[PDB]
Design a protein around this ligand. Structure first.
Ligand SMILES: Nc1ncnc2c1ncn2[C@@H]1O[C@H](COP(=O)(O)OP(=O)(O)OP(O)(O)=S)[C@@H](O)[C@H]1O
Ligand SMILES: [Mg+2]
Length: 319
């Protein structure tokens, strides 16, 4: 029981997820509240079996689910609809069945169907017979998740709530919107992503970098920082000259790269430096700007519109 389906006791706390305060809240009421106080839900008030998370690409939907499942001391079982409907097309019902199977045997637990939209785009046989089986098998499995037992909740995710099979949509009672990151979020994300790395920037800087990347998403900023992080490696990769900037207090001499005429520079390469005596240059403001300036926000307003529309026409109620 593996491969196409991922398992784990995930370890992501609400604090690990940047901003999304409103969504985080939503989920506590929808998920943690029933879990922790369970027979608050006697009678006609029953808990939610289906929760969809929609938003534009990169806004934390996957991460937040893990966070949910961790904040609900749960086990996380997750499938990638794309793959499921295109790369595992052979054993899709087998896999869907196995997903729900494994969930129930590991109660309490959460199922994460990513890219729920990838179960539609309908034609005649390829994506409308060879596929519709999967749509059904999932639908059937979920008749069993409002019935059978509830210690198993389905979370679904899309970046395209407007391609979500009508039938499938309705099966997710509660729907929640995961927007692009606010300045606040965007700043903590820059910090989170950089964490330990030796780095010049003060908080105000990050504040500014945040300010400078409005429109960017979670993945976007992640790309940026990843990119930014190779500056030091690249620099270390390509002097020429190194310096011994260790102070009277380092155990060992710390040889950082430097301009070639420059006080104390002696010409070498990284291949000359010993294990203990290398000193990666700190990230610089310029490092980050360079990175940002060669990234473009992945999400454009066209997307956002369709996103807001769905919020309006299906956001809440039914539907
Ligand atoms: N709110 C957040 N807090 C911390 N990291 C985030 C956040 N949002 C996005 N990220 C980062 O961006 C990565 C990709 O985002 P996901 O968590 O996959 O959410 P998503 O909305 O499903 O984005 P995808 O997968 O591109 S559609 C994450 O694994 C994190 O590295
Ligand atoms: Mg995702």
């Amino acid at each position: 029981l593996s491969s196409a389906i991922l398992s784990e006791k995930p370890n992501v706390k609400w604090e690990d997820v940047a901003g999304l305060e409103g969504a985080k809240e939503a989920l506590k009421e929808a998920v943690i509240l029933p879990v922790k106080f369970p027979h608050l839900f006697k009678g006609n008030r029953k808990p939610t079996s289906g929760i969809l998370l929609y938003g534009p690409p990169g806004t934390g939907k996957s991460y937040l689910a893990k966070a949910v499942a961790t904040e609900a001391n749960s086990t996380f079982f997750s499938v990638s609809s794309s793959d499921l409907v295109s790369k595992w097309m052979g054993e899709s019902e087998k896999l869907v069945k196995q997903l729900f199977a494994m969930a129930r045997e590991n109660k309490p637990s959460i199922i994460f169907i990513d890219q729920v939209d990838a179960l539609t785009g309908t034609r005649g046989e390829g994506e409308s017979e060879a596929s519709r089986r999967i749509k059904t098998e999932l639908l059937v499995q979920m008749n069993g998740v409002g019935n059978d037992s509830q210690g198993v909740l389905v979370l679904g995710a899309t970046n395209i709530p407007w391609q979500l099979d009508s039938a499938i949509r309705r099966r997710f009672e509660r729907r929640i919107y995961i927007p692009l990151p606010d300045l606040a979020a965007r700043t903590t994300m820059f910090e989170i992503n950089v964490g330990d790395t030796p780095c010049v920037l003060t908080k105000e800087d990050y504040r500014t970098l945040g300010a400078m990347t409005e429109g960017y998403s979670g993945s976007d900023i992640a790309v940026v920082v990843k990119d930014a992080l190779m500056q030091p490696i690249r620099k270390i990769q390509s002097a020429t000259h190194f310096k011994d900037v260790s102070t009277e207090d380092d155990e060992t001499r710390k040889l950082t790269p430097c301009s070639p005429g420059d006080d104390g520079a002696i010409e070498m390469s990284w291949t000359d430096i010993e294990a203990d005596e290398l000193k990666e240059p700190d990230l610089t403001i310029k490092d980050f700007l360079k990175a940002i300036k060669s990234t473009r926000p992945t999400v454009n307003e066209d997307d956002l519109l369709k996103q807001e529309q769905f919020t309006r026409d299906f956001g809440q109620e039914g539907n």
